[PDB]
Write a protein that binds this DNA or RNA. Structure first.
Ligand SMILES: Nc1ncnc2c1ncn2[C@@H]1O[C@H](COP(=O)(O)OP(=O)(O)OP(=O)(O)O)[C@@H](O)[C@H]1O
Ligand SMILES: Nc1ncnc2c1ncn2[C@@H]1O[C@H](COP(=O)(O)OP(=O)(O)OP(=O)(O)O)[C@@H](O)[C@H]1O
Ligand SMILES: [Ca+2]
Ligand SMILES: [Mg+2]
Ligand SMILES: [Mg+2]
Lengths: 340, 319
DNA sequence: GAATTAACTGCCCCCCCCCCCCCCCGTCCGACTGA
């Protein structure tokens, strides 16, 4: 259906037609011996066929790194960033979340993950100059009900938080109508949702941000310590699908994760009391891994809770940390607190 | 790809109205399909008839079936907040205890985790005007600590019929974790026949301390607790009831703690912390007064309040 | 006396800092107090 335009000899295309090969993806799916036995023809013509199919699929532009560096507008994924709404957090993240790959947020309960997720959901609708993407967001609740009251309070207090942006266009922004909420209850339900509903929303352009309220919640209620292989298969499939969608539509994916204690009797966590859940198979699918921690009254006997946001690993970010507080306006980082 | 706003005229609209919608900030069919009706009709010169017409055009043109935050808030804004019987606690919780969510109270020993449950079991039958929920109550017991004479005192305090209150509170006793989980299917069957407004489990994690013991049985215990909490969440979401559970405490016998005022943490690990929505921490006060503190909440700040346990139930500290 | 089999034990190294009280068992008398 598509290999017809390729230059070739009639014998090989007749063999392809007799062998029921549809597109270049199908022929690249099979290997050397498989194609040789299917077409029943010599090796050099198979090599020529593979070369021609590869040249058809790709291999046109010689893209150097100067084209990546200088041409800012040609490759937004390498330069454009999604701001977190607070200058201190953006400085810690050197601009914000990347537009490609998966970003993980992990921590214990009552740490402030949902507040950051809501702030990122609101912050995506700003124009590109103000650190937004001029699009909506998708929220997938996997554990419990969505906090509508807190979202309404944040929307009401939004003019107070965005002090730098002048407020003439703030009233034009319709925050409520550009946020989509979904609910799931099983691992299979979440897989079906990400397979079917999410691409429809991203392709048509309603939203350019995907948030999962708790990826670890469905997986902790089905698989025990003796069923690691099916869980690994499901995690690999979900990660592959999410990465493919994010790369295709240039939409950041933010995943919220839970933690489990060390239970001291590796992966880089030597003296840490808690570690991200879902094992190492899930950790291989991510790009930037964060961690939000709260020191309890033992260290928080000073009057107010102590919250620190830490960077665990990233291809372009040193391991750092800062501090932040949660108020009626949102999440704000404490100035002059970044650690080196 | 997205369908531009320049497609509306083929569906039965003139250039003037589609332009009027275009310069209003909207630029595609997808944006206007989910747009609120009042925000669509608040523009001067826009009639409701053509608004409904263009909404129908978008609905038959735009793939519908997607929930929106404004619709989610304006569709479920009739939630109910049951009063706890104490003005200070109602003020601290901003009206009381919400429905469709799980609220847990944890504390030590003689704190008021059962008196509060009894008071809620009584007050949940009040009319919505008086601060109730206008429904029955379900009490699942695991320690054999249910006293109807405590409900009678509250029913007399609020001027309700003594016999009627004891007829609206279904009771059940659990002897193990399997029985406790199995009772939820019967609860689901019963909640269809009538209308319920509250469900009480006391205590949720009392039996797990002794049914599974040691490091070897930790994983099975955690998974069983997670499945039980998932079933509770499903029930709360489906029937729109208020689920209140109670927890216990365990000591911290290591030297990390330094404030030395008997450090203690709730049991259950991370599953019970993540599953529940609002967590309260009750501690002993001077005399019969008690102090309630918000431990975790998605839309509330941590604070403190003082109440007391009286002959008529949970109330306010006397002067 | 000895070849042969059977039963009990063992697998290991990091925390050296120091605000923090909390709900009374005080021991009891002076005086208030309302009845
Ligand atoms: N005005 C406020 N409104 C809401 N929360 C506030 C406010 N002030 C402080 N907070 C804090 O915000 C926190 C919210 O916790 P949050 O829901 O983010 O926790 P989480 O465990 O990360 O969430 P989830 O389990 O839903 O992922 C509370 O612990 C509360 O102390
Ligand atoms: N009629 C009453 N008048 C005054 N106080 C009362 C009355 N009945 C009970 N109390 C007090 O209320 C408290 C009851 O504690 P409660 O049964 O609520 O504890 P809990 O948290 O459920 O404990 P446990 O962990 O043993 O289940 C006690 O301190 C008791 O003195
Ligand atoms: Ca929670
Ligand atoms: Mg949160
Ligand atoms: Mg009790």
């Amino acid at each position: 259906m598509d290999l017809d335009l390729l230059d070739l000899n009639p014998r090989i295309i007749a063999a392809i037609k007799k062998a029921k090969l549809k597109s270049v993806k199908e022929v690249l799916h099979f290997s050397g011996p498989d194609l040789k036995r299917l077409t029943n023809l010599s090796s050099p013509e198979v090599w020529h066929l593979l070369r021609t199919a590869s040249l058809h699929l790709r291999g046109s532009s010689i893209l150097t790194a100067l084209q990546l560096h200088q041409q800012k507008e040609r490759f937004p994924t390498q330069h454009q960033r999604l701001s977190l709404g607070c200058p201190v957090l953006d400085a810690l993240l050197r601009g914000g979340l990347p537009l490609d790959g998966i970003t993980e947020l992990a921590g214990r309960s009552s740490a402030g993950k949902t507040q950051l997720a809501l702030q990122l959901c609101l912050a995506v609708q700003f124009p590109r100059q103000h650190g937004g993407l001029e699009a909506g967001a998708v929220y997938i609740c996997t554990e419990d009900a969505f906090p509508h009251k807190r979202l309404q309070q944040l929307m009401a207090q939004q003019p107070r938080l965005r002090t730098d942006v002048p407020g003439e266009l703030l009233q034009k922004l319709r925050f409520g109508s550009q946020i989509f909420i979904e609910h799931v209850a099983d691992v299979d339900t979440l897989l079906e949702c990400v397979n079917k509903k999410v691409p429809v929303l991203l392709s048509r352009g309603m939203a350019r941000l995907v948030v999962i309220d708790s990826v670890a919640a469905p997986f902790r209620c089905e698989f025990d310590s003796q069923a690691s292989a099916p869980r690994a298969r499901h995690l690999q499939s979900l990660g592959a699908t999410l990465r493919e969608l994010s790369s295709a539509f240039q939409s950041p994916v933010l995943c919220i994760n839970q933690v489990t204690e060390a239970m001291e009797e590796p992966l880089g966590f030597w003296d840490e009391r808690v570690s991200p859940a879902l094992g190492i198979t899930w950790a291989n699918q991510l790009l930037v891994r964060l961690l939000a921690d709260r020191l309890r009254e033992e260290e928080a006997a000073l009057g107010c809770p102590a919250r620190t946001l830490r960077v665990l690993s990233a291809p372009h970010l040193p391991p750092s940390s800062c501090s932040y507080t949660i108020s009626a306006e949102g999440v704000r980082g404490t100035p002059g607190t970044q650690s080196h | 790809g997205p369908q531009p706003i320049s497609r509306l005229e083929q569906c039965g609209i003139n250039a003037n109205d589609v332009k009027k919608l275009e310069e209003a900030g909207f630029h595609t069919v997808e944006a206007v399909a989910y747009a609120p009706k009042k925000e669509l009709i608040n523009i001067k010169g826009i009639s409701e008839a053509k608004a409904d017409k263009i909404l129908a055009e978008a609905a038959k043109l735009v793939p519908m079936g997607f929930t929106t935050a404004t619709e989610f808030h304006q569709r479920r804004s009739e939630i109910i907040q049951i009063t706890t019987g104490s003005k200070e606690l109602d003020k601290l919780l901003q009206g009381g205890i919400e429905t469709g969510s799980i609220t847990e109270m944890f504390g030590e020993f003689r704190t008021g985790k059962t008196q509060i449950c009894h008071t809620l079991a009584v007050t949940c039958q009040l009319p919505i005007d008086r601060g109730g929920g206008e429904g029955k109550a379900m009490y699942i017991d695991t320690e054999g600590t249910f006293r109807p004479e405590r409900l009678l005192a509250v029913a007399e305090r609020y001027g309700l019929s003594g016999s009627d209150v004891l007829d609206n509170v279904a009771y059940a006793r659990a002897f193990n974790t399997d029985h406790q989980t199995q009772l939820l299917y019967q609860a689901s069957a019963m909640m269809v026949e009538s209308r319920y407004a509250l469900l009480i489990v006391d205590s949720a994690t009392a039996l797990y301390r002794t049914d599974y013991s040691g490091r070897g049985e930790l994983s099975a215990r955690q998974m069983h607790l997670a499945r039980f909490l998932r079933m509770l969440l499903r029930l709360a979401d489906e029937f729109g009831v208020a689920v209140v559970i109670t927890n216990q405490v365990v000591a911290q016998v290591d030297g990390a703690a330094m404030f030395a005022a008997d450090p203690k943490k709730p049991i259950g690990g991370n599953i019970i912390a993540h599953a529940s929505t609002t967590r309260l921490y009750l501690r002993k006060g001077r005399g019969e007064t008690r102090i309630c503190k918000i431990y975790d909440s998605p839309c509330l700040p941590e604070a403190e309040a003082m109440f007391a346990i009286n002959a008529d139930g949970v109330g306010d500290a006397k002067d």
